[PDB]
Amino acid sequence: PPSIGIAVILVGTSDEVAIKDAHEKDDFHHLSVVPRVELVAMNETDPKSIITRICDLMSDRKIQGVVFADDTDQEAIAQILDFISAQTLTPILGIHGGSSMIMADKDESSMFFQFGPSIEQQASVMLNIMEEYDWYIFSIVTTYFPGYQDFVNKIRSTIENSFVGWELEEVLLLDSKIQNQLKKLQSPIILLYCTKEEATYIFEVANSVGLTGYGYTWIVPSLVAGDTDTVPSEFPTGLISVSYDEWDYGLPARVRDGIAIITTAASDMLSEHSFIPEPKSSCYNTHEKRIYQSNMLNRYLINVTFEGRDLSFSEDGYQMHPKLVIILLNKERKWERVGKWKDKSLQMKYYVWPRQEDDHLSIVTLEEAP
Amino acid sequence: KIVNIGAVLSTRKHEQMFREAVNQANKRIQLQATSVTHKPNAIQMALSVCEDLISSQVYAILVSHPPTPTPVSYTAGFYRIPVLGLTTRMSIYSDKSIHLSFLRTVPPYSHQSSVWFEMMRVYNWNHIILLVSDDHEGRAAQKRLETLLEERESKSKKNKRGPKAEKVLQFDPGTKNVTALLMEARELEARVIILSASEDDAATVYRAAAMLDMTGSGYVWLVGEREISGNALRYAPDGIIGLQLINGKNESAHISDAVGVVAQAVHELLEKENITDPPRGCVGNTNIWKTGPLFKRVLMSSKYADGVTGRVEFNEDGDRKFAQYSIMNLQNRKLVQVGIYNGTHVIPNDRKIIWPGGETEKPRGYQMSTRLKI
Amino acid sequence: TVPQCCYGFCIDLLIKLARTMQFTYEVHLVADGKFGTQERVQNSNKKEWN
């Protein structure tokens, strides 16, 4: 079993000795090829540094694959990872930070990926939680951030099969007129699609709105949640945002996901096709022979199961069976873990949401017809 | 007070004339400049970009396309730096998501066949049959075709109805056998064949276009110069319909007048204050200064009445506005200029522009078929 | 998927309809079983008229 180079990019604070337990730990004899691990830490946030040390991973060492993770949520470096990745024409997936955060409009020639659900799949999880919310009052207010008409018609798509009359109040394309236009808000849930910095001033106009008070709900996305440790004081109190795990899912376990998905990505290809790619000639010198890449391997690499859980990356790059966590902010000034959502499947801590005006009317009974 | 502005292109004589641009530019308070060549390796391309440009620390940089191809711009976004484009008539560059910042010197093909949608009165033909290659930029292209199309319905809210559409077909890129496309074309009663493609794209288009005589006399096949450019003249069909974007040859003089507007932009930077000078070192500067969005509200807001290339304009996306395309009628295995739009200005030729069929006579493609199916 | 016999007073009314405004009447049958409806597909969230 040949050991092919794999670039593992550890950004920020990380455990290298433990990274040997997340990389060097073992190799699976079920495969006709072996992993070859490359682990270093370059903490620079400049993309030309990603080009530097990555093009060094190709230049000095010889890598058939690569992996990286981010120490922050800035996705410009991810856009880099796309551009230079396809420039290298090799797949990779962000395991942490903005690297794990996907961006819109994945490059066609790019075989790279990331760890996370689709914004579509994200909203789907938001719907499973809507079931967990057991609330019929919804609405749509969101900005020009990516997926605008997309996630619009995607909301209309998620409720497009809805038989129940659960009310989605209105659609709002966000842009003084903030609260002036937004005052029509009715439904108990507060849900929006925009950036997190966009959510800072949006949340400022939300405190300016005051409609966020108790007896109402607030929904936000995984990336919209951003850093759990980062709480803008203007966001809704204990706001409910499910996300991919910022705690539970191991980033070194994500390293097992990367190197693993690389190996299994070589499983059937090396098996039948018996084709593994060579390392790129050079960042300068790989331009001509670059025609030697084809779409079969990654296409063959599509269907996969990581640690038994489906590892297939979506044609858009998301995970076939992504592991998402039901989550919310708390009133303790911390993000409260509200559960986990595995595809349609989901879990939570309690049988009720976090919960003048009366609470509710029990009025217990038993059905007696008529 | 030297203000640094960037540029990129293939032509080195254009780099000489770019240094020349910094001079009269400095005349129209001071100017700075730096340049970088074109690297076949994209890694080398944007790499040496970050070498020069970051060190250059210009707000925006011109770029050509010696033929997506803006990974150096992908570096500008790392600093959220503004970007000044020229070349591509493809609107993948006009996608705002990937690169939040790019400024095209002139409008791409984005309005190209849409100028024919303006010609809906010109040819007075209300039946629109849509052919295309299958690609992203093409997908958005026909999407815009629907927009301006659907735009008429909004205008139709409020002369014998309006410009009705027909089947939209995006041919899978690099089509061996277009027999599916032309096959669909046979059933069409309309004579209006609307498509646009790259050269090797257009291969089966113009080549196989008459293979079934799907262009058969009276069938109007209209397109742009970007469709007519390249090998399109080799197999070029008889009496084909199309135009040529005004000044669509080269971006050199477009770089001249482009600096013409650039001085207006930095002049607004002089008309502004508290702007963030771009940081020098790429490595070591981890935060994009807010001047990028300032460069959006500025370089975007920049409008020059008339430049060396004519009126200097920009769309809402900031490329050009009211831009012209020169109508060129196919004759003698060549395209003879039949006029040009303002975007709105109908210019009839001196000679009658002849259809692929007999002369210029305007057929009606709405002709019904006796066979009536149920 | 081959030709078979078709007749009816309705289809007759079609025939007379052509008998007013003349168009050669081509008899085709249905493919699916339903009449038709704009309907939801299984994926892609695009209107499917059935």
Tab-separated table of N, CA and C in Angstrom, chain A residues 44-49 76 83 87 104-105 146 283-285 287, chain B residues 40-44 50 71 74 77-78 97 282-286:
chain	number	residue	atom	x	y	z
A	44	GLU	N	-0.245	32.430	9.635
A	44	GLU	CA	-0.495	33.670	8.910
A	44	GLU	C	-1.880	33.655	8.276
A	45	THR	N	-2.587	34.775	8.383
A	45	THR	CA	-3.900	34.921	7.774
A	45	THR	C	-3.833	35.468	6.357
A	46	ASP	N	-2.640	35.690	5.830
A	46	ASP	CA	-2.507	36.138	4.452
A	46	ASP	C	-2.719	34.964	3.505
A	47	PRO	N	-3.539	35.117	2.464
A	47	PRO	CA	-3.728	33.998	1.529
A	47	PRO	C	-2.468	33.645	0.768
A	48	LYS	N	-1.649	34.640	0.421
A	48	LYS	CA	-0.365	34.359	-0.201
A	48	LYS	C	0.499	33.464	0.668
A	49	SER	N	0.220	33.406	1.971
A	49	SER	CA	0.899	32.451	2.832
A	49	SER	C	0.330	31.053	2.651
A	76	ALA	N	-12.613	34.395	3.262
A	76	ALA	CA	-11.753	34.776	2.149
A	76	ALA	C	-10.670	33.733	1.933
A	83	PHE	N	-9.725	28.575	-5.088
A	83	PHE	CA	-8.997	29.002	-6.279
A	83	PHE	C	-7.689	28.241	-6.434
A	87	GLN	N	-6.461	25.246	-8.804
A	87	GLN	CA	-5.154	25.477	-9.397
A	87	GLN	C	-4.274	24.250	-9.219
A	104	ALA	N	-20.594	30.227	-1.158
A	104	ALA	CA	-21.436	30.017	-2.319
A	104	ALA	C	-20.594	29.818	-3.575
A	105	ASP	N	-21.239	29.269	-4.603
A	105	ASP	CA	-20.687	29.209	-5.955
A	105	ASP	C	-19.363	28.448	-5.990
A	146	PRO	N	-25.414	35.794	0.307
A	146	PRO	CA	-25.522	34.759	-0.729
A	146	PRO	C	-26.722	33.842	-0.531
A	283	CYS	N	3.990	24.947	-8.503
A	283	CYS	CA	3.096	26.098	-8.575
A	283	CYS	C	3.368	26.911	-9.829
A	284	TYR	N	4.642	27.076	-10.173
A	284	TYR	CA	4.999	27.645	-11.463
A	284	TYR	C	4.918	26.604	-12.575
A	285	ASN	N	5.462	25.412	-12.337
A	285	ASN	CA	5.809	24.488	-13.410
A	285	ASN	C	4.757	23.424	-13.705
A	287	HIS	N	1.731	23.978	-15.019
A	287	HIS	CA	0.680	24.513	-15.885
A	287	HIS	C	0.407	23.610	-17.086
B	40	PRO	N	1.801	32.401	-16.986
B	40	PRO	CA	0.969	31.259	-17.399
B	40	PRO	C	0.466	30.435	-16.229
B	41	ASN	N	1.275	30.284	-15.188
B	41	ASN	CA	0.842	29.580	-13.991
B	41	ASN	C	-0.009	30.514	-13.145
B	42	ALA	N	-1.250	30.104	-12.881
B	42	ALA	CA	-2.121	30.901	-12.026
B	42	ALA	C	-1.514	31.080	-10.643
B	43	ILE	N	-0.937	30.012	-10.088
B	43	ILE	CA	-0.244	30.122	-8.808
B	43	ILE	C	0.847	31.175	-8.899
B	44	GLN	N	1.631	31.127	-9.972
B	44	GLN	CA	2.592	32.190	-10.212
B	44	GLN	C	1.893	33.508	-10.508
B	50	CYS	N	0.474	39.187	-5.604
B	50	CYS	CA	0.692	39.504	-4.200
B	50	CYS	C	2.085	40.060	-3.969
B	71	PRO	N	-7.704	35.252	-10.315
B	71	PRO	CA	-7.220	34.830	-8.993
B	71	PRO	C	-6.418	35.910	-8.305
B	74	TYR	N	-8.844	37.522	-6.694
B	74	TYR	CA	-9.101	36.724	-5.502
B	74	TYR	C	-8.122	37.075	-4.393
B	77	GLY	N	-9.470	40.523	-2.909
B	77	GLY	CA	-10.487	40.302	-1.901
B	77	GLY	C	-9.912	39.959	-0.545
B	78	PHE	N	-8.750	39.301	-0.517
B	78	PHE	CA	-8.094	39.037	0.758
B	78	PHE	C	-7.895	40.329	1.530
B	97	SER	N	-20.932	37.469	-6.210
B	97	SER	CA	-20.639	36.656	-5.038
B	97	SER	C	-19.148	36.371	-4.909
B	282	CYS	N	1.576	41.759	2.276
B	282	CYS	CA	0.478	40.799	2.309
B	282	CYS	C	0.572	39.922	3.551
B	283	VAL	N	1.696	39.224	3.708
B	283	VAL	CA	1.965	38.517	4.952
B	283	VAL	C	2.261	39.540	6.039
B	284	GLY	N	1.521	39.462	7.139
B	284	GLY	CA	1.629	40.414	8.222
B	284	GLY	C	0.467	41.377	8.325
B	285	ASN	N	-0.340	41.510	7.277
B	285	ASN	CA	-1.580	42.277	7.336
B	285	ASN	C	-2.734	41.293	7.189
B	286	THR	N	-3.430	41.032	8.294
B	286	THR	CA	-4.497	40.040	8.338
B	286	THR	C	-5.895	40.636	8.239
